[PDB]
Amino acid sequence: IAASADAQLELIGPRAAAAASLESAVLHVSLTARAYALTPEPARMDALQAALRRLEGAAARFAALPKSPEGAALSGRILAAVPPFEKAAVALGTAVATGGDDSAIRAREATLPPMREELLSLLRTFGALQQAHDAGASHTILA
Amino acid sequence: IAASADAQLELIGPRAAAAASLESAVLHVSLTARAYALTPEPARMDALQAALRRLEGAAARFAALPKSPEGAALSGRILAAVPPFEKAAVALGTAVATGGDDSAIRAREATLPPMREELLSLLRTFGALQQAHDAGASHTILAYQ
Ligand SMILES: [Cl-]
Ligand SMILES: [Cl-]
Ligand SMILES: [Cl-]
Ligand SMILES: [Cl-]
Ligand code: NA
Ligand SMILES: [Zn+2]
Ligand SMILES: [Zn+2]
Ligand SMILES: [Zn+2]
Ligand SMILES: [Zn+2]
Ligand SMILES: [Zn+2]
């Protein structure tokens, strides 16, 4: 009861942490993909690959958190956008790795930033709504 | 697209985490203090005690990370708010423990929530500003040259 309330409130820190880590994974993927387009070395290709695994890991962690009703709606949208984003970043990396046109690399890569922006904008809104519901639930328990 | 830019951007996650975690430690000290005062019992004194050590650790993690210039203002004040809030929390505890008068304990208790809400308000403002700053730095870092 008190224990179950406290269990609810203690999700805050981890929920916020998972959201930011998904945020940061989306960034790191964009950053590593851009850098590999820029300089098609082994270490760069490897860093991109590692970034995509980090992204799948962050999406999964994020997916597992209980969310507020508002929060869960956005969450679905966020998670549904992650596979297309990964997919596009994989095509980029592949286009580079296989020696594509400097023009084909440019085109694959140009696809990413609109997806990145959308993904980051949804997570930012998720953070805002969830934190508001956290504040309401917080007050109910401490009252 | 240099290494120095990854290092900058990789601070986002931990900083955000340390902010949420301090937010949570502060709630948790409030929640255990209240529960103790409502129902004085050994495990509840223990938890308030544990919550206090947790808050000192969360403050220390948060104080350790670099912050944007906007944050640095709010930041300084957040951290200075912690000791007074802990000190009040100890005084509520100690009052319940030493066998306080139902009135005096209500007074010490009442002195907590204002301090909690102010600190949490600051923290959330800090989060919003740092987020806006991180979003602008990320954008710039990934801009086409
Ligand atoms: Cl990054
Ligand atoms: Cl709600
Ligand atoms: Cl709590
Ligand atoms: Cl922006
Ligand atoms: Na509040
Ligand atoms: Zn990175
Ligand atoms: Zn709500
Ligand atoms: Zn708690
Ligand atoms: Zn700034
Ligand atoms: Zn942007």
Author numbering:
A (entry chain A): 37 to 179
B (entry chain B): 37 to 181
What did the article's authors report about this structure?
Adeh_2942 crystallized in space group C2 and diffracted X-rays to 2 Å resolution. Structure was determined by SAD method utilizing the selenomethionine residues and refined to an R-factor of 0.198 and R-free of 0.251. The sensor domain of Adeh_2942 crystallized as a head-to-tail dimer comprised of monomers that form up-down four-helix bundles. The helices α1 and α4 have a kink at residues Glu46 and Ala146, respectively. The N- and C-termini of the sensor domain are juxtaposed so they can attach to the TM helices as expected in the full-length protein. The four-helix bundle structure of the monomer observed in Adeh_2942 is similar to that of Tar and Tsr sensor domains. Comparison of the monomer structure of Adeh_2942 sensor domain with that of Tar and Tsr has revealed a minor deviation from helical secondary structure in helix-4 (residues Ala146 and Thr147) in approximately similar location, however, the two prolines present in Adeh_2942 (residues 149 and 150) are within the helical secondary structure.
We have undertaken a study of the periplasmic sensor domains from A. dehalogenans 2CP-C with an eventual goal of delineating the functions of some of the signal transduction proteins (The term “signal transduction proteins” hereafter is used to refer to transmembrane sensor histidine kinases [HK] and methyl-accepting chemotaxis [MCP] proteins only) from this organism. Although sensor domains have been studied for many years, there are still many unknowns about the actual ligands that stimulate a given response and the mechanism of signal transduction. It is now apparent that both HK and MCP proteins interchangeably use the PAS-like (including tandem PAS-like) and helical bundle sensor domain tertiary folds.
